[PDB]
Amino acid sequence: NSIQIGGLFPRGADQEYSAFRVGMVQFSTSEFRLTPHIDNLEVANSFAVTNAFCSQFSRGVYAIFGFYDKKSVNTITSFCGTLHVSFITPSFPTDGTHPFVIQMRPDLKGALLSLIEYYQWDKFAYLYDSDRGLSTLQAVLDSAAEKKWQVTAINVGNINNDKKDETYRSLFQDLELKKERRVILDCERDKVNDIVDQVITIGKHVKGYHYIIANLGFTDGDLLKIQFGGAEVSGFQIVDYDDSLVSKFIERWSTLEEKEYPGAHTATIKYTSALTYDAVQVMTEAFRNLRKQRIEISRRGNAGDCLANPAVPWGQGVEIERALKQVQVEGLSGNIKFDQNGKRINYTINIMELKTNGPRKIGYWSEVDKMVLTEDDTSGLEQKTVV
Amino acid sequence: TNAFCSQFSRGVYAIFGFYDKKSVNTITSFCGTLHVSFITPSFPTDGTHPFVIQMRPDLKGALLSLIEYYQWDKFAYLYDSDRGLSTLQAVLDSAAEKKWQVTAINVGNINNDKKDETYRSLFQDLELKKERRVILDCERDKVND
Amino acid sequence: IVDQVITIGKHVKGYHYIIANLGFTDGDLLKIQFGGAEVSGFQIVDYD
Ligand SMILES: *[C@H]1O[C@H](CO)[C@@H](O[C@@H]2O[C@H](CO)[C@@H](O[C@@H]3O[C@H](CO)[C@@H](O)[C@H](O[C@@H]4O[C@H](CO)[C@@H](O)[C@H](O)[C@@H]4O)[C@@H]3O)[C@H](O)[C@H]2NC(C)=O)[C@H](O)[C@H]1NC(C)=O
């Protein structure tokens, strides 16, 4: 049983693609074996993806695992609603309800909004780039009106890397305009550090300031450079390094030859890569549950050119979508379950604040129970009471 | 994509058409690659894309100054999903500059079954903050609705 | 010491350091140059 799958990896996602292979051998079987035809492409270019899709499609493919961008996502979701090809991605959740998509990434919109109510914030600023959709911004915008908050929403993405020294001082002249001491960082991990390094140098990281890192990869980036500053830094985790399942992974993964599996030698792993390694598991457990049900999926003939006019949807596509979406496996990203639209459901998200001795978990956000804390601390009001 | 390659294989010299917020990333990509020349009256691109002739003049600056004109400081901004969130993010970045208090509410996703109810649900919630200053920014059809 | 200072936040408006040598611009200064704090030193090689 030789199964052909198409791979869409952006330029230099080395840890993801490395984890992609260590999953191939982890979930390797003697029943069948996934034969991946991989395409290295610039994700941003819609033309590049389109021709790579047409390369994969005419070659005959059962499923595609890839990454998209806010520029490309409406090329992938448009060609996957037509040619019924299943798409697995660790990228941001789709803006709406697109079919034949398996978003390995849990919607973060739900967690962040329930976090702000915990700190009892009322006035803050929002920093974001559109790279992971304007969905998360319209979330804090809509919720702002309901219980009256005050949010300074600033687009941070469109700054070139030739003149950026005076676009950050200018930025934080508008953020002293209302004594802004509470800032949300909903950005790419790179833009997070570019912001932080700049914030370090204008010294807005002492006691009084409070940051929220709105991505599923908190301990992914650098945090030591804001470890002794004093300011409060909050973020989200999803790759629990205390869970024994990932702990075994961490034992092996941190000890691989670094030349073989690039940027994988650490005792830590990015959430995008920890989704890819969990994405392989779901694709494997789906193609076992297709032969277990004895249902056949073998492509009758070639698919032909993808621009086929009129286009023919090969029937077994709607079954592969079904099988994929009904899989329930346990991986790095905790629990993996989907619904009729590919959205991750019944998932754990960790809330992690920064402290002196390191990062620390005060609790978790549930998709059903909202923000629920963890009992491991002593009472703070518990001082010396005088008789 | 099909309609483009259809015209491209026909070897036309310049394409005239439209697009949506979703499709524009396809049009622009195939033009900056195949050197295809495109002309459109739909909303201006989100940057500097080559081989594109936007007949629609940049609307942003005109709107921004009109608020600056009327000496507003606290207004409501209903918005549609259509012509991008360009003329919204503009007034939401300038919010801090000239001291504004912007209430932005999405309206481009109302169902036509309860259209008359949701439109009366919004405004009877806008007498909460009693905001009597509203900018619309919509497809002319959604305006009269 | 400078590197250590930046990390702990003792280089904002409210602090003042005096670099006691003949080569102020000889070292690195850009890592606190925007910090708001005032830093003084001494130059012995006038580039002008
Ligand atoms: C939504 O997501 C929930 C969180 O992942 C998920 O939760 C769990 O439910 C399953 C089964 O109900 C739990 O699995 C078990 O753990 C117990 C205790 O360690 C084991 O004994 C058990 O072994 C079972 O043993 C049976 C013996 O006859 C055997 O027949 C069964 O097949 C099975 O092997 C399971 O290993 C899991 O731990 C739960 N997670 C939690 C809360 O920690 C929900 O299922 C999911 N909701 C739905 C309805 O989709």
From Swiss-Prot, chain B:
Tissues expressing the protein = Detected in forebrain. Detected in dendrites of neuronal cells. Expressed in the pyramidal cell layers of CA1 and CA3 and in the granule cell layer of the dentate gyrus.
Where can this protein be found?
Answer: Cell membrane; Postsynaptic cell membrane; Postsynaptic density membrane
What modifications follow translation?
Palmitoylated. Depalmitoylated upon L-glutamate stimulation. Ubiquitinated by RNF167, leading to its degradation.
Tell me the superkingdom of the source.
Answer: Eukaryota
Q: Induction: what does the entry report?
A: Down-regulated in the pyramidal cell layer of CA1 in the hippocampus by global ischemia.
Q: How does it assemble?
A: Homotetramer or heterotetramer of pore-forming glutamate receptor subunits. Tetramers may be formed by the dimerization of dimers. May interact with MPP4. Forms a ternary complex with GRIP1 and CSPG4. Interacts with ATAD1 in an ATP-dependent manner. ATAD1-catalyzed ATP hydrolysis disrupts binding to ATAD1 and to GRIP1 and leads to AMPAR complex disassembly. Interacts with GRIP2. Interacts with GRIP1. Interacts with NSF via its C-terminus. Interacts with CACNG2, PICK1 and GRIP2. Interacts with GRIA1 and SYNDIG1. Part of a complex containing GRIA2, NSF and NAPA and/or NAPB.
- State the remark under miscellaneous: The postsynaptic actions of L-glutamate are mediated by a variety of receptors that are named according to their selective agonists. This receptor binds AMPA (quisqualate) > L-glutamate > kainate.
The UniProt similarity line reads: Belongs to the glutamate-gated ion channel (TC 1.A.10.1) family. GRIA2 subfamily.
Instruction: State its role.
Output: Ionotropic glutamate receptor that functions as a ligand-gated cation channel, gated by L-glutamate and glutamatergic agonists such as alpha-amino-3-hydroxy-5-methyl-4-isoxazolepropionic acid (AMPA), quisqualic acid, and kainic acid. L-glutamate acts as an excitatory neurotransmitter at many synapses in the central nervous system and plays an important role in fast excitatory synaptic transmission.
Task: Read off the domain note.
Answer: The M4 transmembrane segment mediates tetramerization and is required for cell surface expression.
Q: What protein is this chain from?
A: Glutamate receptor 2
Organism annotation:
Rattus norvegicus (Rat)
Q: Which residues of the full protein are shown?
A: 74 to 218 of 883
From Swiss-Prot, chain C:
> What species is given as this protein's source?
Rattus norvegicus (Rat)
Q: What induces it?
A: Down-regulated in the pyramidal cell layer of CA1 in the hippocampus by global ischemia.
Q: What does this protein do?
A: Ionotropic glutamate receptor that functions as a ligand-gated cation channel, gated by L-glutamate and glutamatergic agonists such as alpha-amino-3-hydroxy-5-methyl-4-isoxazolepropionic acid (AMPA), quisqualic acid, and kainic acid. L-glutamate acts as an excitatory neurotransmitter at many synapses in the central nervous system and plays an important role in fast excitatory synaptic transmission.
Q: What is this protein called?
A: Glutamate receptor 2
What does UniProt say about this protein's domains?
The M4 transmembrane segment mediates tetramerization and is required for cell surface expression.
**Similarity comment text for this entry:** Belongs to the glutamate-gated ion channel (TC 1.A.10.1) family. GRIA2 subfamily.
Q: What is the lineage of its organism?
A: Eukaryota, Metazoa, Chordata, Craniata, Vertebrata
Q: How is it modified after translation?
A: Palmitoylated. Depalmitoylated upon L-glutamate stimulation.
Q: Which residues are glycosylated?
A: 38
Q: What is the protein's quaternary organization?
A: Homotetramer or heterotetramer of pore-forming glutamate receptor subunits. Tetramers may be formed by the dimerization of dimers. May interact with MPP4. Forms a ternary complex with GRIP1 and CSPG4. Interacts with ATAD1 in an ATP-dependent manner. ATAD1-catalyzed ATP hydrolysis disrupts binding to ATAD1 and to GRIP1 and leads to AMPAR complex disassembly. Interacts with GRIP2. Interacts with GRIP1. Interacts with NSF via its C-terminus. Interacts with CACNG2, PICK1 and GRIP2. Interacts with GRIA1 and SYNDIG1. Part of a complex containing GRIA2, NSF and NAPA and/or NAPB.
Q: Any additional notes?
A: The postsynaptic actions of L-glutamate are mediated by a variety of receptors that are named according to their selective agonists. This receptor binds AMPA (quisqualate) > L-glutamate > kainate.
Q: State its location(s).
A: Cell membrane; Postsynaptic cell membrane; Postsynaptic density membrane
Give the UniProt tissue specificity note: Detected in forebrain. Detected in dendrites of neuronal cells. Expressed in the pyramidal cell layers of CA1 and CA3 and in the granule cell layer of the dentate gyrus.
